Amino acid sequence: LMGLEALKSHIMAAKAVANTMRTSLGPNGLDKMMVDKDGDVTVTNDGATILSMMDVDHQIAKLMVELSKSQDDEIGDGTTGVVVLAGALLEEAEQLLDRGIHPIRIADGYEQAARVAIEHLDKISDSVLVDIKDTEPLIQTAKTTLGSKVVNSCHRQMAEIAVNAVLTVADMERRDVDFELIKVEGKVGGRLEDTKLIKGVIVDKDFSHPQMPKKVEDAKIAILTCPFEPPKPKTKHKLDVTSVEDYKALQKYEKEKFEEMIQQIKETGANLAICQWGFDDEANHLLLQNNLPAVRWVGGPEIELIAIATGGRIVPRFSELTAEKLGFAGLVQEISFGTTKDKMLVIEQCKNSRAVTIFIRGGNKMIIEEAKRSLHDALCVIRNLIRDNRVVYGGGAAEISCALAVSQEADKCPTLEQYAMRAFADALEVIPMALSENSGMNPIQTMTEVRARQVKEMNPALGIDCLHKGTNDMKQQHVIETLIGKKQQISLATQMVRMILKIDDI
Amino acid sequence: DKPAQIRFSNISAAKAVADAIRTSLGPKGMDKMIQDGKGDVTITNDGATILKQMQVLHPAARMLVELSKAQDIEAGDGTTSVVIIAGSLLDSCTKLLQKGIHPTIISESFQKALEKGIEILTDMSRPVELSDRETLLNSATTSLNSKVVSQYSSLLSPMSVNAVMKVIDPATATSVDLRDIKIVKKLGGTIDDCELVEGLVLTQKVSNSGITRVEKAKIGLIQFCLSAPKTDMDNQIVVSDYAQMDRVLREERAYILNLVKQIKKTGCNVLLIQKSILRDALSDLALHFLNKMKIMVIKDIEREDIEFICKTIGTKPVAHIDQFTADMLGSAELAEEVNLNGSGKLLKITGCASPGKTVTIVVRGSNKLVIEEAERSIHDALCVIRCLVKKRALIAGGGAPEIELALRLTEYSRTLSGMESYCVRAFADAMEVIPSTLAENAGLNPISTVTELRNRHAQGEKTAGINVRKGGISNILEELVVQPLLVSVSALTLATETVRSILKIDDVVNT
Amino acid sequence: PGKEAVAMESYAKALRMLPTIIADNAGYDSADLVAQLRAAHSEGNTTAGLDMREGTIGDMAILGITESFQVKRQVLLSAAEAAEVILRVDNIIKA
C-alpha cells in the first residue's frame, strides 16, 4: 500500500490511538488501565504515563509517543489534549483527503490556523504577577490541580509549597528562568499532608544518635568521608587486639580521631559530620559521649548530590581536614520522617539557590505515585505560568475561542487551505466534545451552547462545566491554563499532525 | 440499532441515486447510459430524463423521483439541482448520525436552515419589477440566452410574453396556470409561422358539407346519443334480409333530424366527437346529415380539451340530449379553419367570452423533432416566466446562490445556539456540492473553485458565480446565468422537505 | 434530579442484591423474601431483617441478631470505591 491509501490506513491507526486516549481529557478524565511487561497494574488518567507506558506496534504511533515525550516536561497537562487534538485533526483530514486535497496543503492550512489560533490566544490575558503577593493568585491557579485528582481536602499546603519553591529557586523572574534543577521526592508512609519545603536536601538517616542535636545552627558542615570505624567498600573489615588494655589503647586512638578532629572542625565552624559506613553502636557510644549529631549510609549518588548541594567535595583522608574543603549549610533543622513515628534531620543550604526540592508523603504506592504525577504537573504549570505571566481560561474555553477565530478567518483566503482551517476549527472543537464525552453532559449540546454563548456575549471565558459547579462561565470556576501552555499545546498538535501528515513511510 | 440501520440504508439508497445523477447537472452536463431492460442508448445531457425512466426498487429512489417530478411541475429547470441537494443533505445526515445526533433535531434544524436560506436568497437577489413589456422582454431574453434553446426562443419569447399578459395583469402576483396555457401542434410547416391563437386550437373536422368558417359561432358542447342504438348485433333475426333492422336504420335517419331540430332551436355549430365506447355510433351516413345544415363534426375529442373549452367559453359539461339549452352553448366572435403555410384542418375559435383569458400557441416545423423541441422550449419559457411573475426578483445562477447561501448559513449556524447549530453548519457546508459539481463539469479543480467562490463572496461581491459559457469564476459579467428566484426557492424547500421526511421515516414495512 | 437518579437507584438495587444473594444461598424464596423485607422497611421498620435459622422476616431486635457497625460501614465504602475505580477505566492496554 502506497500513497493516499497508505496515508488513509495511517490516519486510521492514529485515530486508533487517539480515540483510545480521548476519554482521559481534563479534570474529569476517565481512567485507563495499564498492564506492563512486569505484570503490574495501575489506574491513571495522566496522559504522559499512558503514552510512555503504552506501546503500539506501528511506527507512526511510535512517533506519536516520541513527539509527545519530547515536550513532556515542557507541557505537563497537555499530554492528553495535544494527542486528542492531533487525532481530531487527522480525523477531519481523512475527509479532506477523501475530497482529494494533497497532504502538504492541509498541513500548511493547519499551520496557518495554528498562527491564527495563537494570535487569538494572545487576546486573552490575566494573572497579574508580583512574587510576594502572588501567593493567593497562584494557589487559585493550582486549584485546578487540587480539585481534579484524589486530593479531596484540596490541601492549600501543596499549592503553596510548589509556588514558594518555584518563586524562591530563581530570584530573577522575568523570563526563561532556570527551573530545571528542582525536583520532588516522596515515599510511601504517612498522610499526603506530610510535606515540607527544603532550601537544600533531605538526607536519609538511621535511628542511632537518638536524643542528639539533630538541629544545629551549623553554617559549615563536615563532609569528612574517612572511616571513623572500619570501612566497607562492599568488603568487611576485621578487628584483632591483644588484651582489654590494648582495646583501651584503641579507644584512646579513637578519642584522638574524634575529639581532636571535631575540635578542629568546630574551630572551622562545623559540628554535624558524615561517615561513609557505620559499623556498630558501641563505637557510636563514644560519639554520643562526644555529643556528636552525625549521619551516615550516604550512597555514591547520594553523597554526590549532597556535595552539589553544599558545594564542598568529599574528604577521604586526614590531610584534607581544612575549612575550605568541607561543605556549607548555613542552617540545619529536623522534621518528622513520617507523620510522627519517625524523625529526620534535614540540611538546608539557603545561601545558594542551586538546590531546592520538595518532600511529600503518601499512604500507598499508588497514592505516592499519583502524588508524584500531580505535583509534577502542578510544578510544570506554575513554572510555565511564571515564565510567561499571560494566561488563558481553560476547560475547553480557549480551544473553542480559537475555533471561532480560525473558523471565521477561514473565509479570508481563496486557496485550498480554507477547508484546512475549517477542519482545524471543528477539530479544536473536540476538546469540549471529548471533555463532555468523558464527562456526563451531552457533548454537542453543551459544546454548541457555550460556542453560541461566546457569540451572544463576547467574553471568551465560557467553557463546559467539568466539576458540576452549575455555571458555564470559567472565570468563577477558575479552571485556568497558562497562555503559553495553550500555545505550546496547539503548536505541538499542529507539528504532531504535520510530522505524520507528510509521511508515505515504508 | 434497527432504526439507525434502516435510516442509514435509506440514506445510502438516496445518496446512490443522487450521486449517480450528480454528473449530469446544468447546461454543460455529461450523460450516462441507462441501465434498462431493452439495452438502448441515451445522449440526453439533462437529468430529468433519467429519473423519469429509472428502474427504481428502494423507496428512497421512488421518493427522489417524486422530488424531481414535483420540482419539474413546479418550475421546470433545476430538476437535477434538487436531487443533488437532497443527496448532499443525506450525506451530511450520514455524518451526523455517524456522530449519533437524533433525526428529529435534524429535521427541525433543517427547517430552520430552510427558513433562513429562503430569507437570504430573497435578500441578495435583484428586485426586478415585472409590470410592463420591457421588463418582461428583459427577463425573457436573460432566461433564454443562458440555455441552448436561444436560437428559436427569440421569436417565441415576445409571443409568450403576450400570452402571459393575456392571462393576468402582472401587477397581480398570483401565479398563472401552466396547464391553462396549452401548447398545440399543426403538422409540418416553417418556424416563424408558430403564432399565438387567442381562444383555442381545436381538432380537425370532417368536411362532407359543413361550412369552413362561421362568424359569431354558436359552439355547442355535445355528449349524447346519435342513433337508434345498434345495441348488440347487426341483425336480430335470420340474415336473409334486414326486414326488421330496416326499422332501426330508418329510425337512425329519423333521429338524426330529430336531434338536429332539437339543436337548431339552440344553434349548435360544431360537434366534438367523443369516442365510440361512449357514443352509440359514428359514421358518414349520419355525419353528412348533421353537416349539411350546419353541425360540423370534429374528430376524437379528449377530456383535456373538454375541460379547456368548458373553462373558456362557458359551455357546461353534457352527458345527455335534454340539456341542449343555452347552458351548453357558447357564442364566440368567429370560428375558422386556417391552412396557411401548409394545409391543416385544425379548427380555431376566436374572440369568445371567457372568465379566464386562456391562450394557446400553435407550433410548426419542418420536422417532428423540431416541433417538439419548440414545444419544450416554449414550455420551459412559460415555466420560468410564471415562477418569476409569481415571486419576482430573479437571481443569478451558476452556484452563486449556493455559495452565498452556504456562507451566510454557516454564519447563521455560528450565531445560532443549541444542538441545531452544528446541524445547520453541516447543512451549509455540504449544500455547496452544486458549485462543486459545476467546477467538476467545467474542468476546474472543484475544491479550489469552491474555495475561490466562497472567498470572493466574502468581503466582496455576492453575485459572483462559476461561469459556464466563458469559464471559471467571474464577477464582472453580471449575466453569467440567471434563473427566477423561485427556481432556488423551490429547490431548497422541496429538497429540505424530502430530506426531513426521509429523516422522519423509520423501519420500512411491507404491507 | 438529573441522570444520577437512575444510577443511584441501580446502586440501591445492587445493594438489595446482597441479602437477595444471602437468601438464595439459604435456599429460601429469595425474591419473595427480599420483597417482604423491602416492604417492611418502606412501611417503616428500621430493625426488620431476615431470620437466617428459618426463612422469614422478623424484627431483628427481639431475635438479637446483629453485626458490628464498623465492619458494615467499611464494607459499603470499600465496595463502592472499588467498583468506582474499576468502572472509571474503559479499556485495558496490554504489552
Next chain:
Amino acid sequence: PGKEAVAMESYAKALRMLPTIIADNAGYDSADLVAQLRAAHSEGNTTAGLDMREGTIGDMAILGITESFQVKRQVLLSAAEAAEVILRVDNIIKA
C-alpha cells in the same frame, strides 16, 4: 409485601418508559428528562410535566397542554388488559 412487588416496580418502569419514548422521538435526552421529571413531581409538585415543545421541565398547570381523562383511563385499562392477555398465555399451538 408479596413477590409481586417486583412486578409492580416493573409495571411502574414500563409506564415510565412511555414519556421516555415521547422524549426519544423528539430527540431530547430521554434519560435526563425522565429522571428530572421523576424528581420534579416525586417531591410533591404533582402538576409538573415534560414540555416537549422545548425539551425542558414544564409546570403543566399554566402551559395548558392537557389530555382528557377518559382517553387516559381507557388507554390505561386497555393496555393493562391486553398485557394480561398476551402475558397469561405461555404456549401456543397451530393447526
Next chain:
Amino acid sequence: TSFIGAIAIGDLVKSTLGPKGMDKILLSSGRDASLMVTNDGATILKNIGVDNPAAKVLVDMSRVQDDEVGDGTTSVTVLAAELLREAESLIAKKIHPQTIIAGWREATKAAREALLSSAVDHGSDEVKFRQDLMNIAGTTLSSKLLTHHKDHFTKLAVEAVLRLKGSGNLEAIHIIKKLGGSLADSYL
C-alpha cells in the same frame, strides 16, 4: 411462547408515538408502484401484516377498544409492548406469570385511582371549557404540518363540537371529504 412478536409490533410502532415522532412508509407487495408515508401508528397497525399470532392477537385486542376512544392506539400498543418486554425480563428472573398478573391488576387499580385523584373538573364555567377544548384539540390535532392550519383545525373542531351543549352528537357529526381551495384552511 416468548414474546418476540409482542415486542416487535411495539418497537415498530414506537417511533410514531405522539407528535414530533417518526414516520413510516407502507408499500404493497410484489414490487408494484404503490407506497404511502404515514405518522399515525394506527395506520401502520391497520396496514400491518401480522405474521406473528401473538402480535395478531395483541393488535386485535387493541382494535376492539383503541380506535373507539381515539389516538390511544399509539399509546396502548407501546405501553403493552413495554409491559411484555419487562415481564419477559421478570420471567427470565423466574417470576411466575400469575404473580405478575396479580401485581399488575393491583398496580393498575392504584394508577387509575391516582389518575382520578389528579384529574381536575372543568364543568360549570364556559371560559374554562373554551380553553380546555382548544388545548385538547391542539393536542389531538397534533398531526398537520402547517401550524396556522393546526390552529385552523383546533378552532373549527372546537366550535363544531361545543355548539352541542347536550348529549353526544358524534353519531351526527361528519367531515366531508370534498376537495376545496387552499390546503391550510378549514370550514364548517
Next chain:
Amino acid sequence: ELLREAESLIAKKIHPQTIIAGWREATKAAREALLSSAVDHGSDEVKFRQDLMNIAGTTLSSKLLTHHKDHFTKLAVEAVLRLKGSGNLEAIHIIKKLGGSLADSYL
C-alpha cells in the same frame, strides 16, 4: 453486583462518570443514614454485658464455627473488660497446639 448493574446501565447509554457521581452521592446518603440509624448501646452495664455477649457471639457465628462460639466470645469480652476500653490485640497471648478436639480449647 455494582459492576453488573454498571454494565447494565452502560448498555442503557448512561455514561460511566455519571454513574460514579451518582454512586458517590448514594454512598454519602447511605453512610449518613446508616450512622444516624445505628444504635449506640451506650452507658449501661448489665444490658451492655448482654449486648457484648450476643454481638460477639453473632459476629463469630459468621465463621464456620457453630458450637463453641459463645465460650470464645465470653472470654474475649472478659479480656476487653480487663482492658476497660484500652483496646489491645496483644493483651491476649495466642499459642497454638495441634491435636485434640475443638472442645479441648482453653483460655
Next chain:
Amino acid sequence: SSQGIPQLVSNISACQVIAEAVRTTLGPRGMDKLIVDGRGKATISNDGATILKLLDVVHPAAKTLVDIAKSQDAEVGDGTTSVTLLAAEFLKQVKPYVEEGLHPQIIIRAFRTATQLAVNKIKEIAVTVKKADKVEQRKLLEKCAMTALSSKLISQQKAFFAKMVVDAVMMLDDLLQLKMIGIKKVQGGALEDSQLVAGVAFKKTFSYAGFEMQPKKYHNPKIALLNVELELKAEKDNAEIRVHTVEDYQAIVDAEWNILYDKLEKIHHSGAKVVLSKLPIGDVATQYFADRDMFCAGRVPEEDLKRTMMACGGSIQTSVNALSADVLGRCQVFEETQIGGERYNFFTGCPKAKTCTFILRGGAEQFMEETERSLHDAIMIVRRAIKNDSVVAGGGAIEMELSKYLRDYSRTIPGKQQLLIGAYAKALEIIPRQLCDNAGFDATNILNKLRARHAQGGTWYGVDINNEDIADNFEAFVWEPAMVRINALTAASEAACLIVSVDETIKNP
C-alpha cells in the same frame, strides 16, 4: 523472465517501483518518509540520498539505479532524487515504444544524442553573474539564501539569517560534505538574536558550582581530548586490614582513589589546559579539576570530537596516556553563554575554521527543524554554485527549457528516433510535474500555462512552490548549478540507457 522485451518491461516496472521510494520526496517541501531499520529503529529523512542509503534494494534494475544515485550523492547529494526520477520517467516514456517492439539500441543512441544536445543547450543558455566580491553580490547570495528560507516568512531577521549563513560558509570553507558546519536549535529566546559561533562546542553544561565560576575567556587554551572518565561508584578496592590503630584504615580509602587522583593530576598537567570527555564526569571530579585551576566537559558527543579533528587540529588522548602538550589541540576563543535556557559552553577559534557553526534560538520546535533543512540546502547551493563555471535557472524551469528544445528538435529530425526524442522530452517534464504535485497536486493546471508561456518566448520561467504560480525562477534567486545539472542529466541518461540496454539477468546459485 524471458529474453528481450518481457524482461526489459520487468526492468521498467522495477525502476518504477524504486522511483516510488523517491517519487514524492523531490521538492524541499515534499513528503518525508519514515524508514524502519531491522533493529526496530525508526528514522525520518525527506532527502532521497539518505532514504536510498538506509533502504536495502534487491532487484538488479533498482540496484543499478540506486548505484547511480549513490554516485550522484557522492557528486552532489541532492541530485539523487532528480537522477532517479529522470531514469524512471525515461523508462516509463519508452515503455509504450519498447513494448511495441523497437530494438532498445535505437533508444540508446537516441538518448545519447538527445542528452549531448541537451548539454550543448545547457552550456549555451547558462548565464553567470558571479562577481561575488562586491557587497551587492554578497547580499545577492543573501537574497538567494532568503528565497531558500522563504518558509519562515520572517521580517528583516530573515535577511539576517541569510547574511549569517552566507558569511559562515564564505569564511574559508571549501567544497566538502558540510557536516562540520551544522546548526543547533534552542528553546525560548528571541529569534531575532542568536550566536554566530566561531567554531563548535558543547551543547549544554551541568548545574555544578564550577560552571557558575568557570573561567570565561581563555586566551589560547590547549585542549585535552579524553573519553575515559572519573565518576562515583565506578571502581573500588576489596582490601581487608586488621586493626592496628585508627590511622590505618585511611590506607584503604586512599587505595580507593589515589590512582584516580594521580591520573587526573598528570593528565591535567600533561600540557593541555582545558579537557573534554565523552562520558559523564563527577562534580567532585570537577572540583578537583578546579583545584587544578581547570575545567572539564563531560558527555560530549562524538561529532564534537570529529569537528575537533577537522577544525581544532587536536588528537585523541582517550586515557591518562600522552602526558605531553605536543599532541594537543589549540583554541583562540572560549567562554560560556547560557543561550536563553541553553547552558552552552563555548570553545571556538581553531587552526582550521572549517566549522563556524550556528545555534538557533526561536522558542519553538516545528519551525527550526524545516529551518535546519532550509539552511542546509541554501548553504549547500551557494558553495556548489561558486565552484561551477555557470549557473542555470532551477526549480522546474530548465527542465522545461530542455523539454521545449528537444521537442522542437525531435519534430524536425527524420527517422524513428524522433518519436523517441519526443518521449525523452516528455519524460524530462517529470521534475516540474513532481514539484507541482508534491506541493499542491495542481500539476496539470500550472504546468499547462507554464509550458505555454515558455513556448511563447525565450524565458527561464518555471514553477514557484511559494505561491503555486509561475515565477521568474531566475531573478527570484532559486537556482541549480549548470555543471551540477549536466552531471545529473548525464548520469540519469547513462543509468537509463544502461538499464534499458540489458535484456537478460543471469543467475548461478
